[PDB]
Amino acid sequence: TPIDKEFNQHVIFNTQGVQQHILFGHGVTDYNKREYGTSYDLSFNQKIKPQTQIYSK
Amino acid sequence: MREVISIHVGQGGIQVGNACWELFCLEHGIQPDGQMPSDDAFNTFFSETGAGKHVPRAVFLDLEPTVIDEVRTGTYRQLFHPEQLISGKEDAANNFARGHYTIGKEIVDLCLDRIRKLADNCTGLQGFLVFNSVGGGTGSGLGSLLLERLSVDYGKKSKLGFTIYPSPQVSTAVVEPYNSILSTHSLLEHTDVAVMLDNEAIYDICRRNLDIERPTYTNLNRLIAQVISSLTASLRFDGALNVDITEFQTNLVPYPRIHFMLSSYAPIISAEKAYHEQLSVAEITNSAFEPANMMAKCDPRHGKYMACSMMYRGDVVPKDVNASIATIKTKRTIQFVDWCPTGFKVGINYQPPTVVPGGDLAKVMRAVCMISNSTAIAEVFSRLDHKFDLMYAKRAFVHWYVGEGMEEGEFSEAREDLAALEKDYEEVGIET
Amino acid sequence: MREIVHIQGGQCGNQIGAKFWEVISDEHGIDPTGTYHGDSDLQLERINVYYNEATGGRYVPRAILMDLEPGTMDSVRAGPFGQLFRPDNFVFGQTGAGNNWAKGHYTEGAELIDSVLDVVRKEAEGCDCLQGFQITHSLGGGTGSGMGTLLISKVREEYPDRIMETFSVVPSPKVSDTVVEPYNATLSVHQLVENADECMVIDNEALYDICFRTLKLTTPTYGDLNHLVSAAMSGVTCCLRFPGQLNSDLRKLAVNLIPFPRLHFFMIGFAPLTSRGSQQYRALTVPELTQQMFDAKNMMCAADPRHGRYLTASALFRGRMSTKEVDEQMLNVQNKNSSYFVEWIPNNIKSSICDIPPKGLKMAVTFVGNSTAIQEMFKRVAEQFTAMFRRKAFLHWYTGEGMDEMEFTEAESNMNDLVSEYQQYQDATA
Amino acid sequence: MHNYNVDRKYQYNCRIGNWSEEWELDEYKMKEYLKNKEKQKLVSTDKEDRLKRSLGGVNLSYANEGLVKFGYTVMIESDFMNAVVASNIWDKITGTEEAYGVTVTSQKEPIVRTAFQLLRYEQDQYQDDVIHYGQNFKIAVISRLSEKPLYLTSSHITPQKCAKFSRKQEVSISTNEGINSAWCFEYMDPKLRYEMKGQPVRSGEPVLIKHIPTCQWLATDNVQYNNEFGQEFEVFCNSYQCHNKTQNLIAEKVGRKTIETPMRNQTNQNTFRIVTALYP
Amino acid sequence: DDLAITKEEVKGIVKTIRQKLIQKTKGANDEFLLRKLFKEFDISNSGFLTLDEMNAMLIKLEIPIQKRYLNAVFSQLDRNHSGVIEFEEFVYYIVNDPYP
Ligand SMILES: Nc1nc2c(ncn2[C@@H]2O[C@H](COP(=O)(O)OP(=O)(O)OP(=O)(O)O)[C@@H](O)[C@H]2O)c(=O)[nH]1
Ligand SMILES: Nc1nc2c(ncn2[C@@H]2O[C@H](COP(=O)(O)OP(=O)(O)O)[C@@H](O)[C@H]2O)c(=O)[nH]1
Ligand SMILES: [Mg+2]
Fold first, then answer.
1. Are residues D156 and D214 in contact, defined by beta-carbon separation less than 8 angstroms?
2. Chain A hits for C273, Cβ within 8 Å
3. Is D35 on the interface with A (CB under 8 A)?
4. How far apart, in whole angstroms, are the C-alpha atoms of residue A51 and residue B213?
5. Number of neighbouring beta carbons within 10 Å of residue B246
6. SS3 of C246, please?
7. Looking at chain A, which subunits does it touch, using at least 3 CB pairs closer than 8 Å as the criterion?
8. Residue D208 and residue D184: Cα distance in Å, rounded?
9. Which residues contact C167 (CB under 8 A, 6 or more apart)?
10. CA distances from E83 to B152, C135, E77, E86, E88 (A)
């Protein structure tokens, strides 16, 4: 059987390789968005309105 | 010449001291780095370094580095003294035994030495101000231990306590009824003044007044900062009638065992509705005495009134102050105890309230803060004791305490003293 | 600072540990070569909790891989993220266990325990302020259920004050991989009740139901189950690793969730889980998260939670949030499900807030609860054990290495005692 | 009541059941592939980058009258393996200093990887550009492979650091500027060791290469080794002297021989070749 | 010219800096301490370090080196003569060097 090498990564990436791709099953147009900010990190110094945070959008 | 020393222990204490000191520096015009722009009304909270910044007369305590180092990394890193932010090694984990008997022993001595060093610099020390969380392990633990040590170390110096008790239905932890009771016993004989600072009572105030449907702890702390500033502005700003902290343990506690009081603050308005409201002295005085406006989840209509002290700031007039007091006395739904014919101590300050940018409160020309001693506080103790015993009957969660080095019999006197206090409050309310 | 060491044994333990280390490396921005390449400073001030520090600008996990057969560890070495672990922490035997509790606990476990004890001890005094332990293994297997439990006993003897947590996957009658699972399951669970400070149960059938009903994916493997378990793990110590409004650590959770010393068995769950179709079609918010958290079919254990009553529960909220809605939802659900909560304790649910949402998410919650519904699995495994032991079937393999039937009798008697004293609180009234 | 997983199933093209979930899952896999194409981190794109830059072209310097001189680009070949030496930058040796291994490759086609330069390590009395026997020099890599100049060095034998396969004195390409980069040329015939000192070295003849701080002759052995470009063999430094011993101390005690002239032959594994350009 | 910086005082300076790092935190540490600052300000993430950064870097770790002395040690460290010093080479020279 030929089974050329490129087909191997192509199928394991698209045709059900025996894994899952980097937590994308748990995801949520494109979701990487490593998002971080604490209450004191911004509210006390950046002076952000206490209603303005959260506010999903 | 007159200075006060602030103590902040526990997560709640740290997170309220942060806001209070932010408001203090903003009000006094001190930059976050600690230096005045320069483009003697600050000795009460800051001490000159001879040439340079102002350093606060405050100390921070916690057995976890999470809250402490965040302040160290924040914009206030140059303001606080590096060695007076005490950080521990292990969290108390909501346990009274650890914070009072095992791990607080080697940390309290360092705190005592730091307080010694801080107080030696001061020459006209007035009193103490402690902020602690009761429903927490290290909050109730060290606070009790520090109060015990202070009461024998300094003695006659007055101390005022702003404690956060658990709310009736608003709650986070499950083992909070246990360590809440013990801290009350510890502070009963050692704290001259105690103020209730529960969370639910402020939660409803926000929705009713500021129309805030999604509040967080930041709104909670800023209001308490306003309360502290309105309480202590008499020391550092001029006014018609100056009131020291001395006329608190002299005008509000008829008996030594009766020193639990609760406060209220008015006006509480947003930035949009400020321009459409009269906001005269009569209205703000009436709003303070409204039962729903109280800072503690307790209805005064179930008890009498023993002594109330209210402090006015801004451009108030004695005529307006006296006129509202007469109407309050005339109106019926508020009642006083028979053996106290006069029950008002009023102080006047000329400085208008200082508003922090980015907050919810609007700029106002007048405000009033009052502290009331009533007999209705026995209700919150009644519901706390019931919750305590209802699960203490089966001795649940006790092994977490006794196995750390705690005597089982300690709960025995913690129960009986609280009942004695409840019946003291009940007996005081009977008429002659 | 209050760092925790990781121990894993058996094939299941190795896979869970590998997936957990991959997830935590992704969270902390750790390269497969061990070099930090993140964007924030918030991923460094607490990096010592899970990763030790070495020369060359690299970080190394403080994990120990322990087993009697080198196949699984040799595979994970060549697998992705297999270069993070130090080769010195790889300890293996040349014989195996054959899925036998006696072999895993007495014959080869006794002679092999010395090396793993030495490495865990040196790692223990490596850190200045130890916090506790966390274990992954399978009670239905031989080598894991025996030798890991022997290590549990030894480490509990050595360190009485430190915490220890177990994430144990237990056999399920619906799918049977081995015909002697009840034997070593009972023998192992006999030894956890007195040693493990925290015990958290995981069921392969429960995870399969989650995959078929919520994720709605047609072709599952063990990898997605491993990822789900790893997410559940990483949710536990989020408050310890990151700043927030209300920090709660392992011992706070223990003292707040353990009413009595013999009731340290918990159920776990994770939210939000959705199929890939409707990922962008639902709102991530406090009411929706708290409503999906308490779903009966969302639990990680095959036990049905509405057949019992909750003793205590804990929720570990993640992401920038507000306390009012969290606590109001807690109170509302507690009031609405008063029949499913024990009456002689008030406000038996704990909420904590961490301000760092996970990868690819804005809000997330990890739920740990203690309820009297856990005993169903103990009942079923005890029934199978009694049925298979009354005929003394397959007992010669166990007794050929010095094992005696009396210790099996003691194990089943202790199981029955625990079941009785665990179910009596359901009917106990003030 | 449309149910899924009903025994046998067709592909996602049909609408038997659960087709939307797999189609949506299949769609996102390509989108993730597109994102991996958007950011330069494709596993595919990496291997052409190493393919093109390693297999680049280069012009080999021609040698006049068969005499090598400083500044040339020359080939290094081992006659025992009939193969030329090469350097793999992508493979990093296990050391605090950043050094790269070198292997000998059977193919003789001139490539950038196997192109090398020689340069005057430090000033010598021989002002002429023609190299004489026993003159110190350092090997350098072509500037296009790496912007930093790289040299061929070898550190002493140690149980800590040794060859991966040969287990003997190991060689590596390192940025070290020290004396370790010094090498000297050496003859084959055991009788003409001491005579050929100071004589010009020619190209196309066999020759030996010796390290100065260690006096170990560079060589290669038939031990399997693998990297990105197929299977190859390793190179190292070792003295492959004859096993039979000679009563040499007796020779000086009587007074027949001298230390400088060696009394032991060596095998052809140490022998190497210098190959220059065929056309000018 | 008043004087030219000599190898003697260059060795003195490099010894002073090398000992100052050791005092901070622990022995296995201080390499990540040096690296995290370069991660903090190397925006173009190319790994090339400049002379102006050297002054800024040493200002951070409590070593205000004189500009003349800083130039001498900077010049002595690099042989490329391009005015740019590789960060990993600098770390190697400061830490992993058998001789002063
Ligand atoms: N109003 C208000 N209360 C707070 C705040 N932070 C903590 N609390 C109170 O503190 C209680 C929990 O204990 P913590 O203060 O967080 O912790 P602790 O007092 O330091 O005790 P340990 O948890 O053992 O460290 C909660 O029930 C809150 O009522 C805050 O920012 N605002
Ligand atoms: N969740 C999960 N379960 C597994 C995995 N591998 C095996 N199992 C389960 O473990 C059981 C067999 O355990 P076994 O391999 O004998 O345990 P060991 O001998 O200690 O490695 C089977 O019933 C499987 O369902 C895995 O990677 N993940
Ligand atoms: Mg706390």
1. yes
2. 26
3. yes
4. 9
5. 11
6. strand
7. B, C, D
8. 8
9. C16, C134, C135, C136, C200, C202, C229, C233
10. 67, 53, 11, 10, 16
Instruction: Give the residue, by CA position, lying nearest to ligand 2 atom 24.
Output: C177
State how far the alpha carbon of B340 is from the alpha carbons of B198, B246, B309, B344, D100, in Å: 28, 20, 14, 10, 92
Distance C413 CA to ligand 2 centre (A): 27
The answer to whether the annotation marks C138 as part of a ligand binding site is: yes
Chain-chain contact of D44 with A14 (C-beta, under 8 angstroms): no
Amino acid letter, C418: L
d(C-alpha C226, C-alpha C230), whole Å:
6
Please tell me if residue A2 touches chain B, with a CB cutoff of 8 Å: no
Stated as kind and residue range, the H or E segment containing C305 is: none
Euclidean distance between CA atoms D104 and D220, whole angstroms:
8
Q: Are strands B58-62 and B54-56 parallel, antiparallel or unpaired?
A: unpaired
The DSSP string of D19-59 is HHHHHHHHHHHHHHHHHHHHTT--HHHHHHHHHHHHT---P
Tally of CB atoms within 10 A around B262: 24
- With beta carbons less than 8 A apart as the criterion, state whether D99 and D141 touch: no
Of C287, C264, C296, the C-alpha closest to C370 is: C264
D218-226 vs D231-237, strand pairing mode: antiparallel
Please say whether the beta carbons of D144 and D212 come within 8 A.
Answer: no
Distance CA C49, CA C52 (A): 8
Method: cryo-EM
The verdict on whether omega for the bond into residue B353 sits within 30 degrees of 0, i.e. cis, is no
CA B173, CA C248: separation in Å to the nearest integer? 10
Name the nearest CA neighbour of C215 among D2, B424, D108, A26. Answer: A26
Q: In what order do the strands lie in the sheet with B260-266?
A: B85-87, B58-62, B3-9, B125-133, B158-164, B193-196, B260-266, B366-374, B305-314, B344-349
Nearest chain D residue to E79 by CA: give it: D177
Question: From CA C88, how far away is CA B137, in angstroms rounded?
Answer: 41
Give the pair of three-digit tokens for residue B14: 């740290």
Amino acid letter for position E30: D
- Whose CA is closest to B293, among B213, B204, B389? B204
Judge if the beta carbon of residue C10 lies within 6 A of ligand 2: yes
Q: Are strands B85-87 and B58-62 parallel, antiparallel or unpaired?
A: parallel
- E92 and D96 in contact by Cβ < 8 A? yes
Residue B203, token pair as written in the block = 């939660």
Domains belonging to chain C, first-starting first, are 3-256 (3.40.50.1440), 265-374 (3.30.1330.20)
SS3 at position B194: strand
B258 vs B375: CA distance, rounded Å: 9
Nearest alpha-carbon partner for E49 in E34, E38, E37: E38
For chains A and D, count residue pairs whose Cβ atoms are closer than 8 Å. Answer: 15
Residues of D in contact with C275 (CB under 8 A): 21
Compute the C-alpha angle C310/C316/C318, nearest 5°. 150
Q: CB under 8 Å to C289, separation ≥6 — which residues?
A: C271, C272, C363, C365
In this structure, what token pair is assigned to residue D236? 């190292």
Distance of alpha carbon B372 from alpha carbon B340, whole angstroms: 13
Tell me whether residue B278 is annotated as binding: no
Does residue B339 have its Cβ closer than 6 Å to ligand 1? no
DSSP at C147? I
- Ligand 1 centroid to residue B380 C-alpha, Å: 19
Q: Is B180 in the pocket of ligand 1 (CB under 6 A)?
A: no
Is B31 in a helix, a strand, or coil?
coil
B221 is in an annotated binding site: yes
Instruction: Write the CB contacts of B204 (distance below 8 Å, at least 6 apart in sequence).
Output: B292
